Paper text:
The S protein on the Coronavirus surface recognizes the human membrane protein, facilitates the viral entry to the host cells, and thus constitutes the main target for neutralizing antibodies (nAbs). Three S1/S2 heterodimers are assembled to form a trimer S protein. S1 contains the N-terminal domain and the receptor-binding domain (RBD) that contacts with the host cell surface receptor protein, angiotensin-converting enzyme 2 (ACE2).8,9 The RBD adopts either “down” (also called “close”) or “up” (also called “open”) conformation, and the ACE2 can only bind to the RBD in the “up” conformation. In addition, we developed a panel of bnAbs against Omicron and other SARS-CoV-2 VOCs and demonstrated their evolution over time.
Numbering used by the authors:
A (entry chain I), B (entry chain J), C (entry chain H): 1 to 123
D (entry chain N), E (entry chain M), F (entry chain L): 1 to 108
G (entry chain B): 346 to 589
The structure:
Amino acid sequence: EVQLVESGGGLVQPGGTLRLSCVASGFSFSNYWMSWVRQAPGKGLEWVANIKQDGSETHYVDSVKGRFTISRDNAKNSLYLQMNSLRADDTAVYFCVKDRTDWELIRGYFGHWGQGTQITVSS
Amino acid sequence: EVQLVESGGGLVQPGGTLRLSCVASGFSFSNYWMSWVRQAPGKGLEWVANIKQDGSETHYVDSVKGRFTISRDNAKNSLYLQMNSLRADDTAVYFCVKDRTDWELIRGYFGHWGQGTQITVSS
Amino acid sequence: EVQLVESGGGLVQPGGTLRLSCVASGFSFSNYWMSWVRQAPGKGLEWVANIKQDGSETHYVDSVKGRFTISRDNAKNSLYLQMNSLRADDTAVYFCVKDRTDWELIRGYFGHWGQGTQITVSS
Amino acid sequence: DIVMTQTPSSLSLSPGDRATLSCRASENIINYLAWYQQRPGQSPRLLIYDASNRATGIPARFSGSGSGTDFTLTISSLEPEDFAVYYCQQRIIWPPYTFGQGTKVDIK
Amino acid sequence: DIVMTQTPSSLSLSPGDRATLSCRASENIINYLAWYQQRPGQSPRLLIYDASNRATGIPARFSGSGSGTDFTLTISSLEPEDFAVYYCQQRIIWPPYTFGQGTKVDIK
Amino acid sequence: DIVMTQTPSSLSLSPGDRATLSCRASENIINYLAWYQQRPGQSPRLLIYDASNRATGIPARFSGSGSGTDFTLTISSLEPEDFAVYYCQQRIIWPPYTFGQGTKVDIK
Amino acid sequence: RFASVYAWNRKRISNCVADYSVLYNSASFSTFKCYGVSPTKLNDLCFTNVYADSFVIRGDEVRQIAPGQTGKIADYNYKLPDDFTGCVIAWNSNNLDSKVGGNYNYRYRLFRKSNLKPFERDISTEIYQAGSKPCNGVEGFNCYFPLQSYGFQPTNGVGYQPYRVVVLSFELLHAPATVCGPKKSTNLVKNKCVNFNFNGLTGTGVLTESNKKFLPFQQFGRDIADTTDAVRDPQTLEILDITP
Ligand SMILES: *[C@@H]1O[C@H](CO)[C@@H](O[C@@H]2O[C@H](CO)[C@@H](O)[C@H](O)[C@H]2NC(C)=O)[C@H](O)[C@H]1NC(C)=O
Ligand SMILES: *[C@@H]1O[C@H](CO)[C@@H](O)[C@H](O)[C@H]1NC(C)=O
């Protein structure tokens, strides 16, 4: 089976800095367009970013840009997302998402999600 | 001519209980999909419920369900609508509506309305 | 070259009365559907009125009607717009606009604008 | 779910001239639209059901047209009782049955 | 940019009957829509990707289709785990990838 | 009545490269759209009228494309005077004539 | 990386085993339209020569890749003959051939004096002369650069998104046996009225050992009044007469 464990979420002040890590075991890291999807408490889903099977076109959501940064590491089978200057509205549950397919034409589908971590921003 | 007399509306407290009755004479009761349509004071029309020429698919408006109940009686040529736990926003003018046609395919048109009764919910 | 000089704008009280004049030299007055376009300070453009190469269908913007009146004079090569009961929100920069073409089918394009005059309404 | 919209909100007219009212849907309905006339101080009345088809007892001054998304009601000559509110209503996608918003035609 | 809309908000049903869910786009996408099932207290799961095509490990009770603006998911018989929230998502016009709003199917 | 929308709000660019601007209508207009260039501290100027057709006195760096709902203006190489605000305007459905919102192209 | 439409690529297929049933049922192609043949009979034919033309166009210009069409792609970018034999395969490629800010590597020609011939290719970059005035290597009024560029952005409506197109073209000229669907060369028989297929040659008759020295380069035997009367077996390379 495919497993997507993740960690890093917690409680910070408005203006803080977090960094979420995400480890993948089941499939074969790389080649897959990993992503990140948030969900506000009591609302529908959203979208944050996704990169490549490499580092190219980090592709943010244009209500976030300049504050988030998504990166990865193929040797460690890891995916990271860093958030600075948290705007007291990025309190949600964040999910690591795989991409359901191997080649670039049929990419874009959020196949095989992981269980999410929670982030609250308050004082 | 078709006549649609109705009664039951009045003044109740938020959390009260009302029951509107509606008698039909002109056409031939049954076979007709009777309905109920509200209109807020100073706003456009809306929709509440409609049943059958029998009792089936009571069909509420999904901002009302669990609080209203529409029923009928063919022997008495009568149509009833009961409201419980009035939410201080169901203050309107309610109209009995016939359904313009005899067979199920062309149903849905609000032919031959009646004159409405008023319901205010306050304290 | 085409020149579109204009004058009349200034400072008046809410409830005042202004009259803007606009003189055209370069092209040949008449035949052209002259117009008037405002722009709020720090916002996008808008539209006010336009008449004819004569006097017909003065064509206001339906948030203004009954307060403005646009007219012209072909012998003097002049275009006038008069404003009464200024609503303390008609503070903008007003532009005389030509209409880019000679015949009625391709009219509607704001070809060869002029430089605008400023109108502030305050107390 | 369908946001029916009446694109003019009020028409100032004179008794005799013609009148046109437009209703625009937010989704493709086809031919299933009706027009009601809320008179001042009276119950509403079905003018036309099914787009261009008139109801029984309605005079020939009222006509209907349009399909897909744009629909239009046309009154040939305004009698003094015709100054009222007009509602458009679809019946193909339920629940709920959505109405328009109203177009108060008045005298000027 | 595309406003995806799920036209019923909640369906009260009984365990065993069918279930129809409709998703409507604000622009012509073609065949590129997926349906996810947010279970109560679990991670979401891709039911169908690419309109009518099922994913691996999904039982045959779920079906879909469409190809334009209107799309529909159909559940043949509600098992007691199927009472959940359902989201529709397009992938042809990005950024951003827009989701639906949710259709909580519950027991009654 | 028609809500014209310019989908990027600001583009940071360098003098010399390409620039693309998109205008999206809320209704089907066809070929009837114009692009104006509000310079800093000057009167606006008609770049292209009728979609892809250039006006007299406009250099060949500006081009236009699109139809129906999506429209696009393209600047081949940014001269230092081209950093300005750009407006799209339709003329087929009046009154009123609706403008866009502005796309301030600046230097970075 | 595909090529632009104004200078399109042309790959020629050689002796092979081609399987078109895995292409016809891939469920990833947005348009699969064969013109000179029914699709289901694709696996059994031996096309003397196969060409494949690959390029990238817009979404609403895929209906101009057809025999006898009008439009700027159809007039002078790529012209299909009216007696076409191959197929047209077209699929969306927004994930590959588009990027944010515009992918300007796909140019197309919008100014030419005359229409193109079928299978003609115009890579010329002369300055177009719209008006009567010559300009001699400079732009201006009615002097245009003939190549514009597609503005490919992923936030585009469907119909302004990059579609990759592959046009297969088959021909049956005079070859002896080329590419062909996968088949099982079942054992040959002799001296019995049989129904035979020799890498394309379909016929009926009795097969018999020959004694006619088929010059090392002669695929088959031609008889006056033009009826096939000898063949060469591809595997063992021996001449056999075909009596009726
Ligand atoms: C096609 O392949 C067959 C074998 O699959 C070849 O048959 C061989 O022919 C030579 C004669 O030169 C014999 O010595 C071998 O024993 C044969 N092999 C078998 C397995 O029977 C045949 O020659 C090949 N075709 C050509 C044109 O060479
Ligand atoms: C050969 O040259 C001609 C010049 O008239 C040109 O049109 C043609 O395209 C060339 N051949 C190929 C295969 O491009």
